[PDB]
Coordinates of all heavy atoms in Angstrom, one line a residue:
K1148 N 64.8 -131.6 6.9 CA 65.8 -131.1 6.0 C 65.7 -129.6 5.7 O 66.8 -129.0 5.5 CB 65.7 -131.9 4.7 CG 66.7 -131.6 3.6 CD 66.1 -131.5 2.2 CE 65.1 -130.4 2.1 NZ 63.9 -130.8 1.4
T1149 N 64.5 -129.1 5.8 CA 64.3 -127.7 5.6 C 65.1 -126.9 6.6 O 66.1 -127.3 7.1 CB 62.8 -127.3 5.6 OG1 62.4 -127.2 7.0 CG2 61.9 -128.4 5.0
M1150 N 64.6 -125.6 6.9 CA 65.2 -124.8 7.8 C 65.3 -125.5 9.2 O 66.1 -126.4 9.3 CB 64.4 -123.5 8.0 CG 64.6 -122.5 6.8 SD 66.0 -121.4 7.0 CE 65.3 -119.9 6.3
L1151 N 64.5 -125.0 10.2 CA 64.6 -125.6 11.5 C 65.8 -125.3 12.2 O 66.9 -125.5 11.7 CB 64.4 -127.2 11.4 CG 63.4 -127.8 12.3 CD1 64.0 -129.1 12.9 CD2 63.0 -126.9 13.5
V1152 N 65.7 -124.8 13.5 CA 66.8 -124.4 14.3 C 66.7 -125.0 15.7 O 65.7 -124.9 16.3 CB 67.0 -122.9 14.4 CG1 67.2 -122.3 13.1 CG2 65.7 -122.3 15.1
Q1153 N 67.8 -125.7 16.1 CA 67.8 -126.3 17.4 C 68.9 -125.8 18.3 O 70.0 -125.7 17.9 CB 68.0 -127.9 17.3 CG 66.7 -128.7 17.3 CD 66.1 -128.8 18.7 OE1 66.4 -129.7 19.4 NE2 65.3 -127.8 19.1
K1154 N 68.5 -125.4 19.5 CA 69.4 -124.8 20.5 C 68.8 -124.8 21.9 O 68.9 -123.9 22.7 CB 69.8 -123.4 20.1 CG 70.6 -123.3 18.9 CD 71.2 -121.9 18.7 CE 72.2 -121.6 19.7 NZ 73.6 -121.7 19.2
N1155 N 68.2 -126.0 22.3 CA 67.6 -126.1 23.6 C 68.5 -125.7 24.7 O 69.7 -125.4 24.4 CB 67.1 -127.6 23.8 CG 68.2 -128.6 23.4 OD1 68.1 -129.3 22.5 ND2 69.3 -128.5 24.2
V1156 N 68.0 -125.7 25.9 CA 68.8 -125.4 27.1 C 68.6 -126.3 28.2 O 67.8 -127.2 28.2 CB 68.5 -123.9 27.5 CG1 69.3 -122.9 26.8 CG2 67.0 -123.6 27.4
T1157 N 69.4 -126.2 29.3 CA 69.4 -127.0 30.4 C 68.2 -126.7 31.3 O 67.8 -125.5 31.4 CB 70.6 -126.9 31.2 OG1 71.4 -125.8 30.8 CG2 71.5 -128.2 31.1
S1158 N 67.5 -127.7 31.9 CA 66.4 -127.5 32.7 C 65.3 -126.7 32.0 O 65.5 -125.5 31.6 CB 66.8 -126.8 34.0 OG 68.2 -126.8 34.2
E1159 N 64.1 -127.3 31.8 CA 63.0 -126.7 31.1 C 63.4 -126.3 29.7 O 64.3 -125.5 29.5 CB 62.6 -125.4 31.9 CG 61.5 -125.7 32.9 CD 60.1 -125.6 32.4 OE1 59.9 -124.7 31.5 OE2 59.2 -126.4 32.7
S1160 N 62.8 -126.9 28.7 CA 63.1 -126.6 27.3 C 61.8 -126.3 26.5 O 60.7 -126.2 27.1 CB 63.8 -127.8 26.7 OG 64.1 -127.6 25.3
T1161 N 61.9 -126.2 25.2 CA 60.8 -125.9 24.3 C 59.5 -126.7 24.8 O 59.6 -127.7 25.5 CB 61.1 -126.4 22.9 OG1 62.2 -127.2 22.8 CG2 61.3 -125.2 22.0
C1162 N 58.4 -126.1 24.5 CA 57.1 -126.7 24.9 C 56.0 -126.3 23.9 O 56.2 -125.3 23.2 CB 56.8 -126.3 26.3 SG 56.3 -124.6 26.5
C1163 N 54.8 -126.9 24.0 CA 53.7 -126.6 23.1 C 52.6 -125.8 23.9 O 52.1 -126.3 24.9 CB 53.1 -127.9 22.5 SG 53.8 -129.4 23.2
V1164 N 52.3 -124.7 23.4 CA 51.3 -123.8 24.1 C 50.1 -123.6 23.1 O 50.1 -122.7 22.3 CB 51.8 -122.5 24.4 CG1 51.1 -121.9 25.6 CG2 53.3 -122.6 24.8
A1165 N 49.1 -124.5 23.2 CA 47.9 -124.5 22.3 C 47.9 -123.2 21.5 O 47.6 -122.1 22.0 CB 46.7 -124.6 23.2
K1166 N 48.1 -123.4 20.2 CA 48.1 -122.3 19.2 C 46.7 -121.6 19.3 O 46.6 -120.4 19.1 CB 48.3 -122.8 17.8 CG 48.5 -121.7 16.8 CD 48.1 -122.2 15.4 CE 49.3 -122.8 14.7 NZ 50.1 -123.6 15.5
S1167 N 45.7 -122.5 19.5 CA 44.3 -122.0 19.6 C 43.5 -122.9 20.5 O 43.4 -124.1 20.3 CB 43.7 -121.9 18.2 OG 44.7 -121.5 17.3
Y1168 N 43.0 -122.3 21.6 CA 42.2 -123.1 22.5 C 40.7 -123.0 22.3 O 40.2 -122.0 21.7 CB 42.5 -122.6 23.9 CG 42.6 -121.1 24.0 CD1 41.6 -120.3 23.6 CD2 43.7 -120.5 24.6 CE1 41.7 -118.9 23.7 CE2 43.8 -119.1 24.7 CZ 42.8 -118.3 24.2 OH 42.9 -117.0 24.3
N1169 N 39.9 -124.0 22.7 CA 38.5 -123.9 22.6 C 37.9 -124.0 24.0 O 36.8 -124.5 24.2 CB 38.0 -125.0 21.7 CG 37.0 -124.5 20.7 OD1 37.3 -123.7 19.8 ND2 35.8 -125.1 20.7
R1170 N 38.8 -123.6 24.9 CA 38.5 -123.6 26.3 C 37.1 -124.1 26.7 O 36.1 -123.6 26.2 CB 38.7 -122.2 26.9 CG 39.6 -122.1 28.1 CD 39.6 -120.7 28.7 NE 40.9 -120.1 28.6 CZ 41.2 -119.0 28.0 NH1 40.2 -118.3 27.4 NH2 42.5 -118.5 28.0
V1171 N 37.1 -125.2 27.4 CA 35.9 -125.8 27.9 C 35.9 -125.9 29.4 O 35.6 -126.9 30.0 CB 35.7 -127.2 27.3 CG1 36.0 -127.2 25.8 CG2 36.7 -128.2 27.9
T1172 N 36.2 -124.8 30.0 CA 36.2 -124.7 31.4 C 35.5 -125.8 32.1 O 34.2 -125.9 31.9 CB 35.7 -123.3 31.9 OG1 36.6 -122.3 31.6 CG2 35.5 -123.3 33.4

């Protein structure tokens, strides 16, 4: 209900990129 904006696109869309990693190679 709050703000939030949606406008995805064709082929490949929004994604999650670890805000913070703890890399465990």
Side-chain angles (χ1 to χ4, degrees):
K1148 183 221 61 222
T1149 81
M1150 286 271 219
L1151 226 222
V1152 298
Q1153 263 285 268
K1154 292 192 68 101
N1155 48 247
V1156 274
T1157 14
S1158 346
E1159 271 269 323
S1160 180
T1161 15
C1162 71
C1163 9
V1164 207
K1166 188 208 270 41
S1167 322
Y1168 40 54
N1169 227 60
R1170 229 186 245 123
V1171 309
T1172 290

